[PDB]
Scaffold this active site. Structure first.
Site, short mmCIF file in Angstrom:
data_model
loop_
_atom_site.label_atom_id
_atom_site.label_comp_id
_atom_site.label_asym_id
_atom_site.label_seq_id
_atom_site.Cartn_x
_atom_site.Cartn_y
_atom_site.Cartn_z
N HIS A 38 11.03 -2.30 7.57
CA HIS A 38 9.89 -2.74 6.75
C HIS A 38 10.27 -2.96 5.14
CE1 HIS A 38 5.93 -3.41 5.66
NE2 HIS A 38 5.73 -2.31 4.98
N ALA A 56 0.79 -1.26 -0.10
CA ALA A 56 -0.09 -0.01 0.00
C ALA A 56 0.78 1.30 0.09
CB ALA A 56 -0.91 -0.02 1.33
N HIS A 58 16.27 -21.49 -7.04
CA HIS A 58 16.99 -22.61 -7.47
C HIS A 58 16.32 -23.61 -6.64
CE1 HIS A 58 20.32 -25.21 -7.82
NE2 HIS A 58 20.51 -25.48 -6.83
N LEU A 110 16.87 -15.39 -5.03
CA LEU A 110 17.61 -16.43 -6.05
C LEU A 110 17.81 -17.86 -5.32
CD1 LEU A 110 20.65 -14.31 -7.05
CD2 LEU A 110 18.48 -14.52 -8.05
N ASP A 112 11.82 -4.55 11.42
CA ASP A 112 10.31 -4.08 10.97
C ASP A 112 9.65 -3.54 11.81
OD1 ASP A 112 7.62 -3.53 9.61
OD2 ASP A 112 8.32 -5.18 8.32
N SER A 121 4.35 -6.16 2.14
CA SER A 121 3.32 -5.61 3.16
C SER A 121 1.80 -5.86 2.77
CB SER A 121 3.47 -3.86 2.79
OG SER A 121 2.52 -3.24 3.23
N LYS A 130 8.43 4.35 11.28
CA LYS A 130 7.71 2.90 11.13
C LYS A 130 8.11 2.09 10.09
CE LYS A 130 5.06 3.53 15.06
NZ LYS A 130 5.48 3.04 16.34
#
EC number: 3.1.1.-
Lengths: 259, 257
Positions: A237, A12, A256, A252, A209, A80, A158
């Site tokens: 975050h 968002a 794999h 990655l 976060d 998020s 935040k």
């Protein structure tokens, strides 16, 4: 041939630009990347007051998933609120996805109510964290539509605590109004175990976060469920802005592994 | 202690976001910065089709100026086409601006028509330069209106060749259609020496500039003239992205200038 295609879905108040530090890295490994722009986001000319449901918002991602070839799979990465968006895509094109990745996001399920995750989060998180965030209505007493617009303080305390000042200035200049879509998601069972539940789920926890604390993150991993759990220490975050490299290496390894 | 107000003005197909590297730096020096977004730019909801004149395009900048109090001057900094926009704020409010900074921008005069530099620019550079850029009309035959929109190739080769891959990724996802507004600027003279021409002019040259080659930049100084010509050697068209510090340093040198 060789390689992989990653679909990045911001959260968002953001857009595709959000993945500007990660995209070059993934591509450096020889992969395809799409930093999509959900409705009312980034440069999309649609106004937020035009989205009546979570679906209207996820229209671009949906249209993209529809344009994938018979043998053109993809790796979903939701950040998020991007976790919710992935849900719609997973329910509709389960086999067209190698695995869904939830980077510090709201990861739903096909057992609880669709807005269960967003409800638990709210209840836990006090309405004080939102600080200068704007919740404005744009519907009707019978069809209530709430909008969410991250303020600068809530963005600097935040979400971007451990991020650079350049990154904060960029976001400040691009963040637009969005929503969480409660009235909608709270009155529907969008995800089913036969479709949504057929897609393997991967979750990337962000320790530092503050928007969605590691507490609520871990919680979802213990109650909702996951196939694998990877964490990025030292990231807030916006782990794609403050820890691109670490994120890319995680994306990655997921590739794999899951085919 | 005294503090300047930098009003940065983005160039074509871009937005106030292009100053994300410079903004923080000017602020740490205790300076107030505003990286405003022009109409149909960055996150503005207007479309380039609702724009016909340079004024319709500069409206946001004009709304910022008029709001400034008399005792609240500012230092305008325009980039690329952002130069023409400074033109309008200058001609209108020449006494509220301490100095006008042209950063690798098209700096207009007060003699010929307003489209001068722009017309002398197209003639001094061939068509191959634009590369994959698009020039689409959305007007009528008796009321022509063209739209400009840099392609990925022209962007990475003519504007971001010296910049990092990140910066190139950012733009690809933000660049929006713009316009040079030739029709409007060719049929009028919006600038005058009395008002426009009485504003201290500073020019920052970026040597490796491909879109607006260091040659034409020098030429604008030789034709339009200035009061101070600064140089940031080694810098491409996107100086605030590949050279934020030197740019910053330069601007803090003009403050007391």
């Amino acid at each position: 041939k060789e390689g992989k295609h990653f679909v990045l879905v911001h959260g968002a108040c953001h857009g595709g630009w959000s993945w500007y530090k990660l995209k070059p890295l993934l591509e450096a490994a020889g992969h395809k990347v799409t930093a999509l722009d959900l409705a009312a986001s980034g440069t999309d000319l649609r106004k937020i007051e035009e989205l009546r449901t979570l679906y209207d918002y996820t229209l671009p991602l949906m249209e993209l998933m529809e344009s994938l070839s018979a043998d053109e799979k993809v790796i979903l990465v939701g950040h998020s609120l991007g976790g919710m968006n992935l849900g719609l895509a997973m329910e509709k094109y389960p086999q067209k996805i190698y695995a869904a990745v939830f980077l510090a996001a709201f990861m739903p399920d096909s057992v609880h109510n669709s807005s269960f995750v967003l409800e638990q989060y709210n209840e836990r998180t006090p309405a004080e964290n939102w600080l200068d965030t704007q919740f404005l209505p744009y519907g009707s007493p019978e069809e209530p539509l709430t909008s969410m617009f991250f303020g600068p303080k809530f963005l600097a305390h935040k979400l971007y605590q451990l991020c650079s000042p350049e990154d904060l200035a960029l976001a400040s200049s691009l963040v637009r109004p969005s929503s969480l879509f409660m009235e909608d998601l709270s009155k529907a069972k969008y995800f089913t175990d036969e479709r949504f539940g057929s897609v393997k789920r991967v979750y990337i926890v962000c320790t530092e976060d503050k928007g969605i604390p590691e507490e609520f993150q871990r919680w979802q991993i213990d109650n909702i469920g996951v196939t694998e759990a990877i964490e990025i220490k030292g990231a807030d975050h916006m782990a794609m802005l403050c820890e691109p490299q670490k994120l890319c290496a995680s994306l990655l390894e997921i590739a794999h592994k899951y085919n």
